[PDB]
Ligand binder design. Sequence first.
Ligand SMILES: Nc1nc2c(ncn2[C@@H]2O[C@H](COP(=O)(O)OP(=O)(O)OP(=O)(O)O)[C@@H](O)[C@H]2O)c(=O)[nH]1
Ligand SMILES: Nc1nc2c(ncn2[C@@H]2O[C@H](COP(=O)(O)OP(=O)(O)O)[C@@H](O)[C@H]2O)c(=O)[nH]1
Ligand SMILES: [Mg+2]
Ligand SMILES: [Mg+2]
Lengths: 1122, 431, 184
Amino acid sequence: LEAFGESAETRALLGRLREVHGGGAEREVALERFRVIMDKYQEQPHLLDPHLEWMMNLLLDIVQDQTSPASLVHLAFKFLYIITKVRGYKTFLRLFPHEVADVEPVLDLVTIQNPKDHEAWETRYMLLLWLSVTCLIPFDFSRLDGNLLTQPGQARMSIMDRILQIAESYLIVSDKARDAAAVLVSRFITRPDVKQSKMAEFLDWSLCNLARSSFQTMQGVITMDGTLQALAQIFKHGKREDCLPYAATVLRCLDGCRLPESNQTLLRKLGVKLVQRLGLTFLKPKVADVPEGVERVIEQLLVGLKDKDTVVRWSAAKGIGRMAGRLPRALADDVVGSVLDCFSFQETDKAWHGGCLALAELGRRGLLLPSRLVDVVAVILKALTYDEKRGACSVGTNVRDAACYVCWAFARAYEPQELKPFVTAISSALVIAAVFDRDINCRRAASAAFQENVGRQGTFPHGIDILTTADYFAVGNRSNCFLVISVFIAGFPEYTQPMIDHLVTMKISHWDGVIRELAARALHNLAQQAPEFSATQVFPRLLSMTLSPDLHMRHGSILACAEVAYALYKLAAQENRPVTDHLDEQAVQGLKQIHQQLYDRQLYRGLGGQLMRQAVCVLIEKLSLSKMPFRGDTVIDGWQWLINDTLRHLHLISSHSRQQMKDAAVSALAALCSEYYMKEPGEADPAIQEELITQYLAELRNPEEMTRCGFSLALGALPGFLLKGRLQQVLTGLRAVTHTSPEDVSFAESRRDGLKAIARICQTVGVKAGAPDEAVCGENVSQIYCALLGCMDDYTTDSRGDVGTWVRKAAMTSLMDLTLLLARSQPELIEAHTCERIMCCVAQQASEKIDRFRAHAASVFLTLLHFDSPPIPHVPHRGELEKLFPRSDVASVNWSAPSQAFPRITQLLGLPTYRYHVLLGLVVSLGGLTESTIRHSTQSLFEYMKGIQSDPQALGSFSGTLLQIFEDNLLNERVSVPLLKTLDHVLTHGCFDIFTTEEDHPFAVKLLALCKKEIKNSKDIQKLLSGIAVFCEMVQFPGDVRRQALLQLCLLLCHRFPLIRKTTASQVYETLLTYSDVVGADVLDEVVTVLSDTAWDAELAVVREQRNRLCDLLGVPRPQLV
Amino acid sequence: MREIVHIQAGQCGNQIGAKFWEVISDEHGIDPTGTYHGDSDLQLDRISVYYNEATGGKYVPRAILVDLEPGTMDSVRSGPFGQIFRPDNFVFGQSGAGNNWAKGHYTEGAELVDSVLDVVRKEAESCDCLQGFQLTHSLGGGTGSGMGTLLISKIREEYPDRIMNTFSVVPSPKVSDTVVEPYNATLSVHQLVENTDETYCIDNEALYDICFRTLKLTTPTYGDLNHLVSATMSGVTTCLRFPGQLNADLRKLAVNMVPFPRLHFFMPGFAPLTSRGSQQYRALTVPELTQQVFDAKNMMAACDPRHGRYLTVAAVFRGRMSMKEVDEQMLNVQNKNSSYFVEWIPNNVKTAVCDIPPRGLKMAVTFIGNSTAIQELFKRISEQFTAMFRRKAFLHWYTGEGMDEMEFTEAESNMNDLVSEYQQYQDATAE
Amino acid sequence: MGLLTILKKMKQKERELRLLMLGLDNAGKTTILKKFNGEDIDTISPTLGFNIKTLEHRGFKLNIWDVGGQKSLRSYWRNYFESTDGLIWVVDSADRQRMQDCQRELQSLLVEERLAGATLLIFANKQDLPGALSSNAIREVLELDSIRSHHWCIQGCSAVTGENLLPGIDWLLDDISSRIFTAD
Ligand SMILES: Nc1nc2c(ncn2[C@@H]2O[C@H](COP(=O)(O)OP(=O)(O)OP(=O)(O)O)[C@@H](O)[C@H]2O)c(=O)[nH]1
Ligand SMILES: Nc1nc2c(ncn2[C@@H]2O[C@H](COP(=O)(O)OP(=O)(O)O)[C@@H](O)[C@H]2O)c(=O)[nH]1
Ligand SMILES: [Mg+2]
Ligand SMILES: [Mg+2]
């Protein structure tokens, strides 16, 4: 925002006040419009400075007119107040009028205010501040009154007297006017005449208010806060020789008031404020004989730093800083020593915030002496690292903020030579914090302090270089500070060992898991800039931390060890040398005892068992990916075991960390099998290959589900050299699970994982034409495609919902991974029928009603269609599909959004091979329950039907396909109601208006019979309603079908459920009102009356007669009891 | 004596809280002075749940006002019932957030969180048995929703054994003209799905439609939306503020209405619907009230419960009726062979009875449903998220503060997973 | 309050300076202000109170005040000695009779506890007058050389012609910016 680009709108809104002050709806609209326009500049209202005056004068020529009604004046004052909250009063009041002709017009307006009118509080607020901006006039209030003895019988009261009676009344109110009363007295008693006239009276009133008021009675607390604020403002904006005489009685009364013990945060803050206001009245202002009251003031202000709230701690720190700046240089040392006591071992973390704030306030003025450098600094080094856990919450944010504030105030508290001794401990602190700090406020707080230090002083090692990179915006993302900027800072030798030490000490022992993972990932990269230091000093450290009793510390140390080992292996892989060159025998000896020291302490149980398993699996993966020298050693046999047990106890892991555990275990198994299970180049161990495979295969039949789910992915992660002659068995074992058996009905995750495992195995072994038990060949490629397609019709619906859909997802990602592979090896294997079936299935799963599975299906379809290297052979209407989905438009498509998917999927009906499946899939969305999906699908279907409604051939083929879909899903509860609703919608829209010309069309003649057979003996209410609607829509077709529909509608009118009886008549009324040719005008006034008068929800025996009577009118044979 | 600490963040949240407090003050019988002039023993039977016991029998609310600018904090302090609130319960800053979640959640929010938690602890320490926490805020603003999520996370970290309630308000284009309201709506939903137990969805599009059509208002303002929200809130907490045969516990109610820890979103409704000023129309019977309360028209959310599945339903009546009538009505509604069968009420509703109706009405009813149709709302904003995130519109306001595109992708994935789970469970067998 | 918020506040305060203009009556205290902004001076009336003007110059927001130079308006100057970053005393060069009143007014203002932290700018106005005293003569009658605890300076100017005012204002702004912060 560079300028106010809403001047005309605001001007019009302000001008409309004179013709919107008599409205209640328009008034609120204009207010809400003025508020939202002014709130845009709440973060930078200075841009509105050039406009302030004109808008202010506009609002003033409405409240400064004599023909202005109270209501119109109240809206102007509300607007005026809206401009004083955004710009603030201290800056917006300087433009208000201040002429001597504005003293009585403003006091007289202040004397017509209703104190009991809560709706007009903005008016009173704007009144008091205006009256206060008018007390600056450089004249005596006496010159203005003139002659008071002009009214005989009753003398007029003086202006000054009226103002004293206005301030005392507004200083005991409960609205916001009391705050405006605090700003008025500050500019009323601080002038010469008022000082000599009413100062004593106001002081007696205040001392009486704070001598009778309490912090328990509500109005008493209201009287306490206002009096304290008034006293503080008077002592702040008051002369020191007119005030010092009263400083002795004010403190004596405040001491007896007992504020520290009172249970009010505002009262204590105001009390500390008033105590620091009186404290400076005794000393002389300095520009860089100690009365006894100063000691009492200091004793009160040094007890306001241990408060339980920060609002009082900040005030106490400000008071201490303002007092130290006025006292001599001798008492300053004692004050600093007394303030330093807040950082004692027995003091809580709350006392540390106040101490650091006081230290910063003292350093800002330059009062700390050099002798206080070895101590104060020694404390700051700790305050920057304050981060403790007090039960379930964490504390240390405000401590670090105050530490950064103190650091930022040391660039002007000492000379460059005075602070030259601690530029190696403070530069390392600032940098370390700005780099690893958790909170973003502290990080940027440490960034600004370092900038100020390098700007003012400029003695820190590489100040400009560290400031250019680690700037205010660069430290915004925490991830960028740990993995990028950290390495850049460590590039220099002055910020390498300290940062690594701070990371290994505190960050590794942190309570947050994400922070530990980030610290480990940062150490991974930092080890590159210091391999020797990380291999000789950090590795022993982390190794000793893996034997700690702390769980989080053990996990962090294990992660750090794994990351350092991986980094050392990567670094050594460049020079083509073994990883043992970095780690010593003792180091590789301790990496073979981590797991045996955990399993022997039973550290794999409880809530920490999952974390320990994750850490050990990550360590095993990082060690196997480095080709460590543990081949032949029994330690390997241990690692493998720890994996199996995990896959055997996955159900024990929480539901919020089982997928990650399974993935990590599978990755560790994959890294281990392709490293420690190889006998020769290209071969594998016969004993292990046999035992592991037999165990895994026999495990697939365990009735437990999570075990099968884990072992599936385990099989799907084995290398290729271990399946050179065992594929014919692994594939059969995986396919045996993909089948749905009577016992494994609700077992969907097992098959979902088996499909993914088959995908991975097929991808690893590849294609070799001739070798069935070694690779995917033309002998074991058909079975695979048949097993993958048999899991695409998984519509299992249970109490958990449509869980089968999950399996379908695994069928879309698996079938793809196979196809793309064949095209990249032996495209001939991709048969035409199989490819057509896969495409039709993908089309159906992309025309579904769920939004996340439908979106996944469209992406898979586009990926399979946009494959050109080489082009997948046997693609029905390939060119048609390519023209319908150009590559340029696919870059921006919201497939998840039905609006941006249904109109693009409905066009597939034009293709014969897709027309059937696509419609079977779209029926579920056209007859589902989602309203938006129903609307979008119906609109997209009508947009396509409009193009083939006047075509007897296209419309006929569409109706035939719809009826074939209906027949194929006869008596199917998942396709009966949705398809019936779709037919009802299509009939209501009038798409089949051509078949209604002749009589007895082959379409309706069988559609009616199918609907009858579907609704024959049905108790579902939704199904009954759908059938009734279909039979009430099918009446448009003349011939025997019309008479049969009327007989069915009469049969349904007398159903067991009165609700159905009423709904049938309600729908028949609409059907008769729609089609007029169905019934002649000679018996039309006889049907509507019988339907409106007869109560179809009453006795069924009585309604049978009325219903039978409607059979003698419609001309429908009257049924009987069979 | 179970005490619940009330909280209200943001302008909309503070206004809704003030309106609800002023509405319940007239029902409990506590004049704005801070004393009780009520003439019913049932009023003071559970007044401690939302009011403290001070000297002279003066009742003090348990609300905690919080903001980043002072304008709204000043309007409530001078409101009709601005004296009952403690002066030291008002926590505020000066600059605000600027309709930016990153500025109201990570910077100013985390800067004033200390002063806010100070008062939160000061209030919690003055309670015999703390039950949970309640928060009223919106989802289309920066300060409001940001500070709300931050305070919820802080209260969960410092008090994991406490229930959390959030009467979040969903924005709407017909009420606001801000372009970055979808981003803040997506982030708050992601935070709430992780750190919340109850979430009463109050759409700002359904309320506008009701005020425009039902109330027949030419130009409805926030005063026609806040009154309805406060009425619905008072109807929801009818059992928590007055006696009742039904279990009026918050933890048990949440456990019964939270069978799924990700689908904890509740659509609230209430009949009869009234405007401001005119409220004494007629006294609807129990059948009419039950038919109107379960109607999509009397729903505070833009979604229709009929277009989904009923997971849990809680009904609460108040007026002059016996539990036998409500039981007979609810049992005959589900009777497929009766003359009063419908198709939008499940076979299990937690009915309640009360003898203290609201002001200007002799009878009233409130309904709370955990239906899956709420997912539709979650898909209304999601679409907008696709028309901005893909173009990186206004992304420099978020990335410049500290946020990463990794946070946006995670929130989008969480919303998509929630919608998918809702749509999947919507197709479960009704056994 | 966070360090970042504390710094945002320090910048806004330093961006706004305060200059209190004082001097004997009929010394051109209003003419200089009206000329420094580009307004008209022929339609100036004798101030019967006080005036304030918020302008911008060299990136600094100057809120210049101007109080009456009358005796009954001299007993109220104490009402504007707060947060004053600079002081500007105007002296009529052509006035040779009331040369002790200004010397007595400036001395009493120099012994002020609240004005100790500010930069003094002496504007010897009305230089084109034939009977106007040069800068050297005025620098000897106002006892300006004796001053040591205040960064004072004296430059002759003419408000009617707008001469030598910009250099003086620039020197004042530079001397005010040379410092860091001010006292409370
Ligand atoms: N129903 C209703 N919605 C409101 C009301 N006030 C604001 N809103 C909505 O709240 C959303 C965000 O505005 P606020 O909540 O006022 O903003 P904030 O939360 O204080 O945040 P900042 O502006 O960043 O300080 C918008 O979508 C508004 O339409 C209200 O009184 N009633
Ligand atoms: N010759 C001359 N006359 C001036 C100069 N400045 C001001 N005056 C006149 O001196 C008179 C006093 O001016 P005024 O500003 O009202 O004095 P103030 O009220 O103390 O500020 C006015 O009539 C001015 O036009 C100047 O530089 N030269
Ligand atoms: Mg706001
Ligand atoms: Mg003048």
